[PDB]
Amino acid sequence: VEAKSRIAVVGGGGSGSVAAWLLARRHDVTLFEADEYLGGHAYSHPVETDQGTLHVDMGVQHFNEKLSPNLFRLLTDFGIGTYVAPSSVHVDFPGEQQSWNNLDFLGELREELHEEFDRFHQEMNQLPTSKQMSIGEYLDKHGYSKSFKYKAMNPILSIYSGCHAPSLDYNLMYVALSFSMNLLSFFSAGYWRKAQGGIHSYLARIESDLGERVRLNTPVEAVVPTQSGVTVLAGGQEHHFDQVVFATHADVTLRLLRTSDQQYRDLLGDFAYVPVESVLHQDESWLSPAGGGAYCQFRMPEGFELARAEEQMGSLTRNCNVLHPYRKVSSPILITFDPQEDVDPERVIVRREWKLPQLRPVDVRRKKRLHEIQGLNGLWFCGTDTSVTGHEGAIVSGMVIADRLGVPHPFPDDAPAAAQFRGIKEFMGV
Amino acid sequence: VVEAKSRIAVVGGGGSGSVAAWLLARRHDVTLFEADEYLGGHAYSHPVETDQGTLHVDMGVQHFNEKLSPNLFRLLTDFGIGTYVAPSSVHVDFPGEQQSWNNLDFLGELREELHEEFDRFHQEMNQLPTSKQMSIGEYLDKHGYSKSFKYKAMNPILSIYSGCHAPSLDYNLMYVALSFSMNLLSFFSAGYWRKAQGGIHSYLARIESDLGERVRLNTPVEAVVPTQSGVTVLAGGQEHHFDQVVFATHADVTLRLLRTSDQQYRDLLGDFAYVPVESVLHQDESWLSPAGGGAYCQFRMPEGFELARAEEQMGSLTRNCNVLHPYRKVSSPILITFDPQEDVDPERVIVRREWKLPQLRPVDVRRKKRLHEIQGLNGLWFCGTDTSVTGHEGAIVSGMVIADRLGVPHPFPDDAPAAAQFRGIKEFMGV
Ligand SMILES: Cc1cc2nc3c(=O)[nH]c(=O)nc-3n(C[C@H](O)[C@H](O)[C@H](O)COP(=O)(O)OP(=O)(O)OC[C@H]3O[C@@H](n4cnc5c(N)ncnc54)[C@H](O)[C@@H]3O)c2cc1C
Ligand SMILES: Cc1cc2nc3c(=O)[nH]c(=O)nc-3n(C[C@H](O)[C@H](O)[C@H](O)COP(=O)(O)OP(=O)(O)OC[C@H]3O[C@@H](n4cnc5c(N)ncnc54)[C@H](O)[C@@H]3O)c2cc1C
Ligand SMILES: CC(=O)O[C@@H](CC[C@H](C)CC[C@H](O)CC[C@H](C)CCNC(=O)[C@H](C)O)C[C@H]1O[C@H](O)[C@@H](C)C(=O)[C@@H]1C
Ligand SMILES: CC(=O)O[C@@H](CC[C@H](C)CC[C@H](O)CC[C@H](C)CCNC(=O)[C@H](C)O)C[C@H]1O[C@H](O)[C@@H](C)C(=O)[C@@H]1C
Ligand SMILES: [Ca+2]
């Protein structure tokens, strides 16, 4: 792929935006984004409160310097601060005092499951130094109770996966690492950061630097390789490019792409997802009377039956008032994910509906296999479905494509950023 | 060349000695001399009589974890000794009204005063090991940190390790950076630490049993003299004769006991620096902080604190053992205060222990490493905390390194992190 080629980036989430941003240094880049902003799952909604206007992260919220070095470095270079936002967690179930949390040892569930929490930490710490099973399999295989599976493991895993997810089917190392890196924990609040004035700040900066190259509100309808180059059909027009980089979800990538080949069907067809509803609201009734200063608060509703555990599901609520920059703020600012009961519509600021990728061992395998179509027909692929999960994974896949199309990894000097890049470059087959 | 079935003495029955003896006894005729009336040294568990039974309360060595202490952890596992999590929740109180911070919530005037610096500090410690042979103190000065942060946050939280008498701010930076990046110490969460079931003594009791009458308690070695034939040890008004001698005593003890014509021995063992610690096991509930609720570790600085005189002044750390899981049904207060400044109500004191700890300044580390040039000369060997990395894993693995060197290989080769720790500590000592 020679210099100054005409290149399209389809999808303006984190992966696409970063990929575009880097590519624009060497190539004539156009970036198509379906919705009216840049960031995708990274969205920050303004809330005006008696102490000012605050941008509240509704999808992507959390990362840290160790897990997310490239994103972290990027935030730093753009002069965006961060702050610690510890993952304190409270779980409530139907009965009297049927709770645990990871700040104190109070609650009946904690009492019921403490020995298992204790064992679990040890075993997760011992794993990465020795197992292509799911967390669920592991738990069954190693003597853990069903109460532990569905009253502790599955709710704490909802911090990542949404309360609709079959999180217990997700890959074991994902969970083991989360516990050994103090991201999820039954004994302490996990070490996580947020970005100053919302996650969108970095994306706003990218949007500015890209200028007129960014086509918002322009959903690509299809993408067709030809003998000369690749044609993109978007917004009642046809545009002509030398290369096309996909930064869309596989099921979108597959619908849009229209080729004679059926390996494309073989690879992109079987990706599975999970719906998530993020409801930004001020209805203080969703806070737990027990769950005091806990950032993350899970409630399972009346009617929970352990026998029917796989069908039933709770809601996770985040108390943003516990964040340090919100500590002077007088209005409640809450986000409930996947609420089962409806939220008082007089108190709802806004909803967003999104989907997240399943992370079963098979899905990981499926992601990796996308290397055999990478570069064929002047097509490239980045996004969460090509990488490790989380935002670092998303955006670094963008960087991997840009490196592959000439524009090298911009932080070679940063040892952990570089290693993450090398690792993700190895994960994708690029 | 140390051939099989040689007569070998281990001088000192702390963790290092006991483990070293235990392994050596598989190949050699071992005797282990310990000065005091039990095996373990700083590892001491005192019985306390309570409404739930008899509890063994750790007074010195208390905490470790599977990641930091793989060999110790495996040993407990093989002996069938359980562990439990004992999160390091921390509350700091200073003289004023509400002059506190803690690592469970964001309450307190000191939290308000210092939040920005705690936040920055975590980042910077996480970024360090991926890039610096200075002290934590130097680092803090060099990187713009306030004196309030140095003496009201860093020095108190470092007292969890060093004792409230220590010049902790002069200790090595990587020691601190690692502690923060491994979630051992933290300003935002409770650190991940474990305790052993029925006290730390459990493993040592098991070692004592397996060694049998090879263990001489209450038998302080008076001196150790190499000769042409072997080495003579003078203890308990008698002389015993050995082919080799392994020291598991502190350098200043090792030096007093040892007597040779050589003055490199003086050069190496002479300049080791220590810190006193008083551990007071008691039931005076007045030492608990009215603010500091369910916090395991509670630091108090007394009235009279002057930031300008910060280097002379010092607080006391109190541990609320009633917050530990196995003590949750217990109705009597069980507290340990370390280095109390005010006196503890002697009607409520169960027992005191006075101990000393090694200083961990960059120079002290250098000093430890240099002990390789005397290792094996005159049929003498050296293990213990003064030869190794700090903490119990370091102590006991130094014992294992000597045993490996005297034939008995590292007993946990198939545990990858245990083996790597062994290799690392073998490299640290020059053995
Ligand atoms: C509720 C929620 C919370 C999350 N929280 C976190 C968190 O705290 N931390 C974290 O690390 N990760 C989080 N994630 C993961 C998140 O998916 C990644 O961090 C990252 O944002 C994924 O980026 P992406 O660019 O790969 O996909 P997306 O962010 O979905 O963006 C892809 C873009 O493609 C666009 N698109 C779709 N069809 C078309 C078309 N025809 N034409 C043009 N564009 C199209 C979409 O409109 C979208 O903007 C969260 C996800 C969700 C749903
Ligand atoms: C208060 C305190 C708390 C601590 N807490 C922890 C903790 O929580 N976690 C952790 O990992 N580490 C901790 N340590 C560190 C501790 O030093 C090591 O874990 C380890 O126990 C030191 O082992 P050692 O055998 O090298 O020294 P010691 O355990 O001190 O052993 C030295 C032994 O030599 C003996 N001795 C002295 N003179 C003679 C003589 N003439 N003849 C024979 N024997 C003699 C002593 O009686 C003693 O038994 C703590 C130390 C102290 C003081
Ligand atoms: C090697 C490395 O550094 O990356 C690891 C990935 C660990 C993830 C980055 C941890 C989770 C993400 O950071 C972010 C999840 C985020 C916090 C979602 C938040 N969601 C919500 O708030 C709502 C409730 O849904 C490796 C794992 O990545 C794969 O995706 C995973 C399936 C694995 O098996 C790998 C071991
Ligand atoms: C290789 C490895 O993992 O070990 C690291 C050191 C990590 C320490 C051993 C971590 C803490 C100790 O294990 C535990 C100290 C213990 C909790 C003392 C408790 N004391 C008390 O309770 C009272 C108040 O005195 C490396 C450091 O070891 C060196 O000793 C240190 C001086 C260093 O510079 C190295 C970086
Ligand atoms: Ca009860």
Author numbering:
A (entry chain A): 4 to 133, 139 to 438
B (entry chain B): 3 to 133, 139 to 438
Paper text:
The catalytic mechanism proposed for LkcE involves initial oxidation of the amide function of LC-KA05 to an iminium ion. This is followed by attack of a C-2 enolate anion on the iminium to give the 17-membered lankacidinol A (2)8—an enzymatic intramolecular Mannich reaction.
Of the five mutants, only E64Q and R326Q yielded co-complexes with 1; 7 was not observed in the active sites, as the acetate of 1 was clearly visible. In the E64Q structure in which R326 is present, the protein is identical, but the substrate adopts an alternative orientation, which allows it to interact with R326 (3.1 Å between the C-23 carbonyl of LC-KA05 and the R326 side chain). In both structures obtained in the presence of 1, the observed linear configuration of the polyketide chain would not permit subsequent cyclization involving the C-2 and C-18 centers (they are separated by 13.2 Å). The side chain of E64 would then initiate ring closure by acting as a general base catalyst to activate the enol (there is no counterpart of this residue, to our knowledge, in other MAO family members).
